[PDB]
């Protein structure tokens, strides 16, 4: 009945092989068009510059390049995915100025669900009309106090075709260079000891998109006239990869500490180009190019019980980030054609000895939870410190004290009410990994620049009597000292700096209602937001790039589904409709290369779907779907407004999964 979370068993009844399709019933997240990292993400209209994907509680905030979205995990690795729309209190961790996607990798215990034994094999296959094929396999089990798992998954997707009316630069229906060969695996071993009180989990996960991909992944190929032509978009072979090595600890009843949760991880993002020759951003490195972002981090979270219903929570977060290119290239630095200035400038850039940019985030927090007779009060405090070192070796540091509090009030067994007022900070992000080389100039940080500081406020209610269900939230957010890294990535300027450049206001709401009577499930959801960026700098420093957000149109979703008892079988309808949207995220208007009058056409997608459980149980699903049944030609709103990447046209899908 809840659209904000999807569980594993739910996903086994589903035919989708990426997050955007998996979460399409949740209205306050929106995805852009295109495949893999073509996709930008928004939460309440706010972009990946602000919203993190945390998997097993490991996450970074750096990007590869402003023309592509931050990597979004492959759902076949996860036992559960949540959207926390809100933020969270003092113990949410580093940078939680907005909500997040939260995901946890799958477990032996999870894969074992269907079965009457301690070991197992899983096989899946999928076929998609528009257009691709997927298969994988998984082995897992538990013995003595150990659990272990190995999973392999591959989704080979061809170029997809848009809905009725869209044409290619060469007259065809498909989206050029939208093919990716997607591979992922997971190795996991865990142990439970200390008379069942202590648990250790060690895991390694790879997730790799490989294919023929444009310079700027957010665009395809337009005709020879447009800035988007075949030699300007210049598609070589590329491999983009997320990796994650995680060590997780969990203790209960450890003296005066009631619960301890700890984790240490390494997180790598790599970009491999076969030939970056015709890619200016990467510096036209001829042949093989490798860019890497490494994130090391550590979290310790403690809970001590102070009275029968009063918990004290305290802990530490440390995160280190390192951008690491193949090689610096500020040597090749060049300005086009007072130009006396240019010359003193090329000179400057050439004499610079560049090094790997780094960012350390440290946090400590304390939080109290007091609960009495259906009324819960949470109050809390964080100290956030950061250190940023740019590729020019310059170091800037700041710290903040962040208070937060909230209440949950439950007067009655069907109803509950919540609100909160949280402060949180986010430290400047490092400039695009792919430009770190310096060819286009030095990217520094001005003296004394501060963390963006967010004030989040919200109220909501929740109602559920086993048959009707309903939920609502209203939220407000101010972000002060919004950071702007230097926005123009074309153009060669000698020294430019990240600064506090203005402030951000956003407000809006979501509603959900549902009805479930033996077999029949009905759901509706609506969500609307209003992110607005204000420049407080003479130079208007803020930008309308999708990484930041977009004014999405009011989004409505709905589904209707019936589960039969004979056979075990569910048929369903699902739709997402988004209304006409008007306006930039920027108050001062956004501009071409001149003032753009932004309007995003509205559109409606319908899907039908089926899930057939032939053995009367969860070990074999045969699923069938038809997505975008009317073959609606449209463009998602979470992306630029000039007609970039369409949403997939009618797609038909059949997937099977089988544990035994
Ligand atoms: Fe560009």
XYZ file of C-alpha atoms and ligand atoms in Angstrom:
661
model
C 0.000 0.000 0.000
C 3.068 2.254 0.482
C 4.655 3.773 -2.749
C 7.851 5.048 -1.078
C 9.373 1.621 -0.361
C 9.765 -1.471 -2.427
C 10.697 -4.752 -0.821
C 12.510 -7.690 -2.476
C 9.538 -10.027 -2.763
C 7.641 -7.109 -4.372
C 10.392 -6.604 -6.912
C 10.369 -10.351 -7.747
C 6.712 -9.793 -8.917
C 7.911 -6.977 -11.157
C 9.539 -6.784 -14.524
C 11.657 -3.651 -14.088
C 15.437 -3.730 -14.146
C 16.243 -0.111 -13.042
C 15.150 2.256 -10.259
C 13.250 4.708 -12.479
C 10.737 1.952 -13.426
C 10.778 0.467 -10.007
C 9.886 3.707 -8.277
C 7.501 5.059 -10.871
C 4.569 4.964 -8.526
C 6.242 7.313 -6.027
C 5.325 10.790 -7.111
C 7.963 12.968 -5.431
C 10.891 11.275 -7.145
C 11.322 11.882 -10.814
C 13.830 10.466 -13.264
C 15.143 11.853 -16.481
C 15.088 9.999 -19.832
C 17.733 7.785 -21.291
C 19.647 4.883 -19.940
C 22.216 4.636 -17.132
C 23.877 7.890 -16.226
C 21.955 9.843 -18.879
C 19.441 9.918 -15.958
C 19.096 12.788 -13.515
C 17.134 12.362 -10.339
C 14.929 14.695 -8.381
C 13.343 14.543 -4.878
C 10.714 17.159 -4.227
C 12.215 18.829 -7.284
C 15.806 18.974 -5.932
C 18.685 17.374 -7.776
C 21.630 15.090 -7.090
C 23.747 18.074 -6.078
C 21.631 17.817 -2.872
C 20.154 14.256 -2.784
C 22.356 11.178 -2.040
C 21.904 7.486 -2.867
C 23.259 5.576 0.101
C 23.729 1.892 -0.288
C 24.581 -0.098 2.782
C 25.152 3.201 4.395
C 28.051 4.140 2.048
C 27.644 7.208 -0.202
C 29.686 9.918 -1.890
C 28.746 13.373 -3.197
C 31.149 13.872 -6.126
C 30.157 13.718 -9.776
C 31.859 12.569 -12.974
C 30.513 15.427 -15.236
C 27.616 17.930 -15.248
C 26.384 16.393 -18.512
C 25.605 13.130 -16.789
C 23.804 11.995 -13.672
C 25.383 10.520 -10.602
C 25.385 6.637 -10.801
C 22.159 5.046 -9.555
C 22.467 1.487 -8.216
C 21.165 -1.666 -9.912
C 18.067 -2.942 -8.226
C 18.997 -6.537 -8.663
C 21.535 -6.054 -5.899
C 19.053 -4.856 -3.261
C 16.788 -6.475 -0.675
C 14.959 -3.181 -0.072
C 14.799 0.433 -1.319
C 13.419 3.420 0.493
C 12.808 6.957 -0.374
C 13.183 9.107 2.722
C 11.702 12.293 1.413
C 12.565 14.341 4.470
C 16.131 14.643 5.724
C 16.429 13.266 9.175
C 17.707 14.289 12.439
C 21.094 14.444 14.106
C 21.841 10.819 13.545
C 21.134 10.746 9.820
C 24.938 11.220 9.068
C 26.937 13.589 6.847
C 25.281 16.202 4.611
C 21.633 15.133 5.033
C 20.180 18.512 3.976
C 17.691 16.614 1.890
C 16.154 13.231 1.686
C 17.816 10.291 0.146
C 17.380 7.005 -1.594
C 18.361 4.277 0.834
C 19.069 0.779 -0.252
C 20.485 -2.314 1.358
C 22.163 -5.097 -0.509
C 20.624 -8.531 -0.523
C 21.354 -11.303 2.059
C 21.421 -15.004 2.160
C 18.522 -14.828 4.679
C 16.497 -12.901 2.080
C 17.148 -15.272 -0.810
C 16.329 -18.195 1.410
C 12.825 -16.832 2.054
C 10.808 -19.147 -0.196
C 12.601 -22.395 0.695
C 12.607 -25.341 3.152
C 16.463 -25.549 3.508
C 19.725 -23.737 4.296
C 21.194 -23.421 0.761
C 19.870 -22.324 -2.591
C 20.164 -21.258 -6.224
C 18.399 -18.455 -8.013
C 18.047 -17.946 -11.696
C 16.282 -15.139 -13.554
C 15.762 -14.162 -17.261
C 14.114 -11.207 -18.778
C 13.169 -10.114 -22.223
C 12.150 -6.668 -23.279
C 10.600 -5.646 -26.626
C 11.991 -2.166 -26.490
C 14.577 -3.598 -26.215
C 16.852 -5.918 -24.293
C 17.668 -9.110 -22.474
C 18.574 -9.916 -18.934
C 19.600 -12.961 -16.955
C 21.401 -13.769 -13.755
C 22.157 -16.297 -11.146
C 22.756 -16.408 -7.476
C 24.018 -18.952 -4.925
C 23.550 -18.580 -1.149
C 23.085 -20.321 2.138
C 23.761 -20.459 5.856
C 25.542 -23.074 7.987
C 26.581 -22.965 11.583
C 26.875 -19.272 12.323
C 27.766 -18.232 8.781
C 25.829 -16.839 5.860
C 27.110 -16.273 2.401
C 26.042 -15.274 -1.015
C 27.304 -14.775 -4.559
C 25.171 -12.954 -7.234
C 25.777 -12.221 -10.891
C 23.407 -10.091 -12.981
C 23.441 -8.769 -16.547
C 21.003 -6.576 -18.455
C 21.936 -6.155 -22.153
C 19.917 -3.315 -23.427
C 19.686 -2.224 -27.030
C 18.768 1.291 -28.109
C 15.227 1.968 -27.011
C 12.532 3.501 -29.082
C 10.487 6.486 -28.009
C 6.736 6.828 -28.320
C 4.622 7.572 -31.454
C 6.026 10.546 -33.379
C 9.676 10.798 -32.326
C 12.310 10.796 -35.013
C 16.100 10.344 -34.870
C 18.572 12.548 -36.691
C 18.451 9.701 -39.384
C 14.661 9.255 -39.487
C 14.432 6.160 -37.207
C 12.487 5.556 -33.974
C 15.260 4.621 -31.555
C 17.468 6.865 -29.305
C 21.038 6.773 -30.609
C 23.665 5.498 -28.138
C 21.237 4.488 -25.507
C 22.515 0.865 -25.471
C 24.341 -0.208 -22.366
C 25.585 -3.624 -21.432
C 24.923 -3.621 -17.638
C 26.726 -6.042 -15.275
C 26.749 -6.370 -11.516
C 27.794 -8.763 -8.863
C 27.719 -9.194 -5.123
C 29.847 -11.336 -2.818
C 28.692 -11.370 0.785
C 29.834 -13.245 3.893
C 28.470 -12.622 7.331
C 28.705 -14.270 10.712
C 26.579 -14.182 13.870
C 28.263 -14.886 17.150
C 28.231 -13.897 20.815
C 25.200 -16.043 21.561
C 23.379 -14.360 18.707
C 24.170 -10.782 19.920
C 26.862 -9.788 17.493
C 26.901 -9.785 13.690
C 29.740 -9.053 11.145
C 29.137 -8.645 7.437
C 31.804 -8.274 4.761
C 30.688 -7.564 1.267
C 31.991 -6.566 -2.152
C 29.819 -5.168 -4.911
C 30.557 -4.141 -8.615
C 28.156 -2.458 -10.941
C 29.320 -1.689 -14.453
C 27.655 0.002 -17.443
C 29.525 -0.643 -20.667
C 28.671 0.586 -24.217
C 28.946 3.163 -27.069
C 28.199 6.418 -25.285
C 28.229 10.117 -26.247
C 30.461 12.833 -24.824
C 27.443 14.363 -23.025
C 25.262 11.494 -21.783
C 22.235 13.733 -21.131
C 21.913 14.321 -24.941
C 21.752 12.047 -28.008
C 22.768 12.968 -31.618
C 20.829 15.739 -33.389
C 21.314 16.721 -37.064
C 24.581 18.232 -38.559
C 23.312 21.819 -37.975
C 22.624 21.461 -34.158
C 25.310 21.570 -31.393
C 24.391 17.897 -30.861
C 25.844 16.357 -34.099
C 27.784 13.033 -34.572
C 31.301 14.554 -34.434
C 30.489 16.992 -31.516
C 28.816 14.130 -29.519
C 31.676 11.823 -30.705
C 30.703 8.360 -29.209
C 33.590 5.918 -28.306
C 33.376 2.805 -26.113
C 33.089 3.470 -22.382
C 32.873 1.554 -19.113
C 31.334 3.375 -16.080
C 31.591 1.482 -12.770
C 30.482 1.698 -9.118
C 32.234 -0.496 -6.567
C 31.775 -0.929 -2.870
C 33.624 -2.905 -0.276
C 31.814 -2.801 3.084
C 32.544 -4.162 6.517
C 29.405 -3.971 8.787
C 29.184 -4.594 12.513
C 26.067 -4.966 14.783
C 26.020 -5.482 18.580
C 23.270 -5.716 21.305
C 23.579 -5.754 25.148
C 27.180 -4.551 25.276
C 27.410 -3.237 28.827
C 25.914 0.259 29.088
C 25.558 0.388 25.300
C 22.350 -1.293 24.273
C 22.884 -1.290 20.478
C 25.964 -0.455 18.403
C 25.915 -0.200 14.564
C 29.276 0.385 12.762
C 30.477 0.261 9.295
C 33.717 0.931 7.342
C 33.738 1.086 3.534
C 35.659 1.853 0.318
C 33.662 3.282 -2.589
C 35.131 3.694 -6.126
C 33.516 5.330 -9.087
C 35.634 4.743 -12.359
C 35.246 6.071 -15.834
C 36.977 4.280 -18.645
C 37.070 5.654 -22.105
C 38.378 3.621 -25.070
C 39.342 6.954 -26.783
C 38.750 10.430 -25.369
C 40.337 12.009 -28.468
C 37.214 14.058 -29.432
C 36.066 14.785 -25.854
C 37.184 18.277 -24.759
C 36.065 17.790 -21.118
C 38.388 14.753 -20.657
C 41.097 16.793 -22.470
C 41.166 14.800 -25.724
C 43.453 12.206 -24.288
C 44.182 10.011 -27.250
C 43.222 6.335 -26.669
C 42.687 4.773 -23.149
C 41.624 7.239 -20.394
C 40.882 6.309 -16.711
C 39.222 8.612 -14.157
C 38.619 7.482 -10.564
C 36.816 8.812 -7.383
C 37.616 6.972 -4.169
C 35.550 7.389 -1.008
C 36.625 5.977 2.337
C 34.393 6.209 5.290
C 33.468 5.106 8.683
C 30.423 5.371 10.938
C 29.908 4.361 14.514
C 26.431 4.590 15.943
C 25.664 3.941 19.658
C 22.359 3.616 21.536
C 22.069 3.795 25.380
C 18.768 3.324 27.281
C 18.486 6.019 29.958
C 15.045 5.003 31.365
C 12.385 2.491 30.312
C 11.362 4.551 27.277
C 14.121 7.065 26.805
C 16.951 6.238 24.362
C 20.145 8.287 23.986
C 21.811 8.011 20.548
C 25.401 9.168 19.895
C 28.028 8.533 17.198
C 30.741 9.617 14.742
C 30.884 9.769 10.926
C 34.046 10.193 8.953
C 34.111 10.371 5.164
C 37.235 10.904 2.882
C 36.963 11.601 -0.806
C 39.645 11.597 -3.474
C 39.384 12.486 -7.150
C 42.263 10.838 -9.124
C 42.706 11.440 -12.878
C 45.104 9.552 -15.211
C 47.243 12.671 -15.492
C 47.140 16.424 -15.251
C 46.887 18.449 -18.428
C 46.941 22.041 -17.394
C 50.002 22.125 -19.644
C 47.825 22.092 -22.733
C 45.823 25.020 -21.442
C 44.665 27.468 -24.180
C 42.546 30.632 -24.605
C 41.034 31.743 -27.958
C 41.202 35.218 -29.516
C 43.498 42.442 -23.795
C 44.817 39.110 -25.268
C 47.923 40.306 -23.439
C 45.867 39.208 -20.432
C 45.249 35.741 -22.025
C 49.039 35.276 -22.348
C 49.838 36.166 -18.694
C 46.958 33.776 -18.023
C 48.191 30.756 -20.101
C 51.490 31.309 -18.357
C 49.778 31.059 -14.912
C 47.917 27.892 -15.644
C 51.045 26.253 -17.129
C 53.196 26.930 -14.088
C 50.669 25.259 -11.725
C 51.511 21.884 -10.282
C 48.242 20.174 -9.862
C 47.443 17.397 -7.403
C 44.449 15.186 -6.450
C 41.528 17.149 -4.927
C 40.366 15.861 -1.539
C 37.476 16.416 0.944
C 37.251 15.195 4.531
C 33.910 15.328 6.299
C 33.821 14.605 10.081
C 30.694 14.505 12.186
C 29.691 13.903 15.761
C 26.076 13.800 16.988
C 23.992 13.267 20.109
C 20.246 12.676 20.054
C 17.554 11.889 22.767
C 14.332 10.037 22.219
C 11.644 10.276 24.778
C 8.395 8.343 24.397
C 5.285 8.606 26.679
C 1.829 7.104 26.042
C 1.834 7.594 22.220
C 3.876 10.828 22.196
C 7.488 10.713 21.079
C 9.945 13.594 21.294
C 13.342 13.632 19.566
C 15.872 16.386 19.990
C 19.365 16.462 18.789
C 22.634 18.042 17.926
C 25.376 17.599 15.312
C 28.806 19.046 14.934
C 29.862 18.915 11.289
C 33.390 19.717 10.228
C 34.868 19.652 6.710
C 38.237 20.223 4.942
C 38.370 20.802 1.177
C 41.631 20.676 -0.771
C 41.369 21.729 -4.439
C 43.659 20.469 -7.269
C 45.733 23.563 -6.679
C 46.577 22.381 -3.162
C 44.588 25.220 -1.395
C 42.792 24.211 1.814
C 39.520 25.607 3.244
C 37.729 24.519 6.373
C 34.526 25.204 8.261
C 32.363 23.681 10.956
C 28.694 24.004 12.071
C 26.517 23.152 15.057
C 23.203 21.635 13.753
C 20.139 21.333 16.092
C 17.080 19.266 15.246
C 13.884 18.143 16.905
C 10.555 16.511 15.950
C 7.501 14.755 17.387
C 5.425 11.748 16.562
C 1.977 11.757 18.147
C -0.160 8.751 17.982
C -3.557 9.385 19.539
C -5.284 6.286 18.313
C -4.410 2.918 16.630
C -5.270 4.067 13.135
C -3.741 7.575 13.187
C -0.463 9.300 13.725
C 0.866 12.820 13.272
C 4.369 14.107 12.878
C 6.413 17.172 12.510
C 9.998 18.343 12.610
C 12.327 21.248 12.362
C 15.885 20.123 11.498
C 19.089 22.013 10.715
C 21.831 20.199 8.646
C 24.846 21.284 6.585
C 26.382 20.068 3.376
C 30.080 20.701 2.592
C 31.123 21.983 -0.852
C 31.379 19.275 -3.447
C 34.576 18.735 -5.488
C 34.358 19.919 -9.085
C 33.569 17.363 -11.869
C 35.925 14.454 -11.775
C 36.369 14.451 -15.544
C 37.865 18.001 -15.592
C 40.132 17.630 -12.575
C 43.074 17.488 -15.010
C 43.110 21.308 -15.393
C 43.229 21.663 -19.153
C 40.416 24.169 -18.989
C 41.843 26.073 -16.050
C 42.211 25.949 -12.276
C 39.123 25.224 -10.111
C 39.714 26.457 -6.588
C 37.697 27.502 -3.506
C 37.453 31.130 -2.279
C 38.731 31.985 1.207
C 36.384 31.244 4.053
C 33.552 29.616 2.045
C 31.045 27.933 4.293
C 28.910 24.734 4.157
C 25.408 25.223 2.672
C 23.103 25.163 5.771
C 19.611 23.875 5.544
C 16.576 24.455 7.739
C 13.884 21.872 7.070
C 10.445 21.988 8.376
C 7.542 19.592 7.995
C 4.214 18.242 9.160
C 2.308 15.167 8.117
C -0.260 12.683 9.127
C -0.793 9.030 8.527
C -3.981 6.902 8.601
C -4.413 3.128 8.217
C -7.390 1.010 9.479
C -6.531 -2.192 7.534
C -8.724 -1.129 4.579
C -8.554 2.634 3.927
C -5.098 4.225 4.228
C -3.950 7.788 3.674
C -0.902 9.903 4.243
C 0.086 13.581 3.729
C 3.146 15.803 4.253
C 3.817 19.467 3.828
C 7.432 20.609 3.899
C 9.433 23.882 3.768
C 13.158 24.204 3.339
C 15.528 27.051 3.325
C 19.100 26.454 2.181
C 21.419 29.321 3.090
C 24.822 29.846 1.472
C 24.045 27.574 -1.499
C 27.314 26.670 -3.146
C 28.079 27.298 -6.731
C 31.135 25.673 -8.258
C 32.201 27.562 -11.409
C 29.407 26.899 -13.859
C 30.780 27.276 -17.344
C 32.739 24.119 -18.294
C 33.438 25.290 -21.808
C 35.709 28.326 -21.900
C 39.172 28.592 -20.486
C 39.714 30.851 -17.491
C 42.764 30.814 -15.410
C 41.522 30.726 -11.830
C 37.920 30.311 -10.739
C 36.521 29.445 -7.344
C 33.670 27.688 -5.602
C 31.678 30.167 -3.458
C 28.587 30.617 -1.359
C 26.443 32.168 -4.111
C 22.852 32.627 -2.779
C 20.025 30.706 -1.225
C 17.381 28.187 -1.950
C 13.697 27.998 -0.951
C 11.499 24.999 -1.603
C 8.065 24.061 -0.291
C 5.305 21.639 -1.260
C 3.253 18.602 -0.363
C 2.509 15.009 -1.023
C -0.688 12.902 -0.506
C -1.321 9.107 -0.778
C -4.633 7.207 -0.235
C -5.316 3.478 -0.739
C -8.041 0.829 -0.562
C -7.416 -2.913 -0.223
C -10.296 -5.474 0.033
C -9.478 -9.191 -0.287
C -7.356 -9.259 -3.443
C -8.152 -5.738 -4.768
C -5.574 -3.018 -4.111
C -6.260 0.571 -5.246
C -3.724 3.493 -4.720
C -3.459 7.162 -5.601
C -0.591 9.589 -5.020
C 0.017 13.232 -5.866
C 3.055 15.415 -5.129
C 4.028 19.004 -5.993
C 7.064 21.154 -5.118
C 8.531 24.584 -5.872
C 12.419 24.734 -5.687
C 13.655 28.229 -6.179
C 17.238 29.378 -6.439
C 18.136 32.967 -5.571
C 21.418 34.615 -6.598
C 22.934 36.956 -4.032
C 26.086 37.588 -6.124
C 26.634 40.449 -8.757
C 27.744 37.761 -11.207
C 24.727 35.448 -11.337
C 26.595 32.361 -10.227
C 23.863 29.778 -9.818
C 22.766 27.499 -12.689
C 19.726 25.573 -13.932
C 21.657 22.436 -14.692
C 19.624 19.284 -13.769
C 22.120 18.196 -11.054
C 20.604 21.080 -9.054
C 16.895 20.306 -9.606
C 13.897 21.276 -11.844
C 10.391 22.664 -11.574
C 8.612 19.348 -12.196
C 4.808 19.521 -12.872
C 2.380 18.260 -10.183
C 2.807 14.497 -10.404
C -0.069 12.001 -9.968
C 0.309 8.238 -9.932
C -2.208 5.524 -9.496
C -2.486 1.834 -9.690
C -5.269 -0.769 -9.600
C -4.597 -4.478 -9.232
C -6.451 -7.719 -8.542
C -4.935 -10.906 -7.071
C -6.802 -14.161 -7.817
C -6.584 -17.186 -5.556
C -6.821 -19.617 -8.428
C -4.377 -19.552 -9.906
C -1.914 -17.389 -7.898
C -2.119 -14.424 -10.222
C -2.340 -10.612 -10.096
C -3.385 -8.363 -12.917
C -2.908 -4.698 -12.628
C -2.976 -1.296 -14.158
C -0.460 1.477 -13.212
C -0.168 5.080 -14.408
C 1.811 8.191 -13.800
C 0.536 11.515 -15.156
C 2.457 14.744 -14.874
C 0.894 18.164 -15.490
C 2.254 21.063 -17.528
C 5.179 22.726 -15.637
C 6.305 26.367 -16.013
C 9.530 28.043 -14.894
C 13.198 27.801 -14.177
C 14.540 26.729 -10.773
C 16.300 30.202 -10.914
C 14.399 33.361 -9.829
C 16.471 35.514 -12.161
C 15.402 33.309 -15.157
C 17.671 30.892 -17.056
C 19.372 31.758 -20.374
C 20.602 30.124 -23.626
C 23.876 31.383 -25.280
C 19.276 35.133 -23.579
C 16.139 34.530 -21.331
C 14.518 31.038 -21.728
C 10.716 30.883 -21.204
C 10.545 27.280 -19.757
C 7.411 25.156 -20.253
C 7.434 21.342 -19.936
C 4.518 19.701 -21.673
C 2.429 17.380 -19.526
C 1.885 13.742 -20.404
C 0.404 10.476 -19.159
C 1.917 7.021 -19.060
C -0.150 3.878 -18.596
C 1.208 0.330 -17.864
C -0.530 -3.068 -17.481
C 1.147 -5.921 -15.674
C 0.815 -9.417 -14.422
C 2.428 -11.689 -11.853
C 1.815 -15.443 -12.018
C 3.029 -17.631 -9.217
C 2.556 -21.122 -10.694
C 3.545 -23.111 -7.578
C 1.281 -21.097 -5.304
C 4.356 -19.603 -3.642
C 7.159 -17.101 -3.803
C 9.870 -19.326 -5.356
C 8.765 -18.958 -8.978
C 7.478 -15.771 -10.513
C 6.506 -15.364 -14.068
C 5.839 -11.735 -14.799
C 4.438 -9.954 -17.783
C 4.259 -6.274 -18.393
C 3.383 -3.754 -21.087
C 4.798 -0.304 -20.242
C 3.616 2.888 -21.895
C 0.736 0.943 -23.525
C -0.459 4.015 -25.519
C 3.138 4.468 -26.680
C 3.100 8.106 -25.461
C 5.753 10.244 -26.917
C 6.977 12.600 -24.095
C 9.926 14.045 -22.173
C 10.417 13.478 -18.444
C 10.637 16.696 -16.447
C 13.810 15.847 -14.435
C 16.284 17.011 -17.100
C 16.767 20.033 -19.348
C 13.657 21.470 -20.984
C 14.828 21.669 -24.644
C 13.866 18.250 -26.022
C 16.722 16.058 -24.746
C 15.979 12.350 -24.137
C 12.416 10.991 -24.413
C 10.860 8.390 -22.181
C 10.723 4.866 -23.438
C 7.885 4.105 -25.835
C 5.661 1.032 -25.494
C 7.883 -1.690 -23.986
C 6.763 -5.259 -23.474
C 8.538 -7.359 -20.889
C 8.564 -10.816 -19.655
C 10.776 -11.894 -16.750
C 11.095 -15.087 -14.781
C 12.735 -15.845 -11.470
C 13.156 -19.186 -9.842
C 14.681 -20.197 -6.541
C 15.146 -23.883 -5.801
Fe 28.557 21.491 -22.140
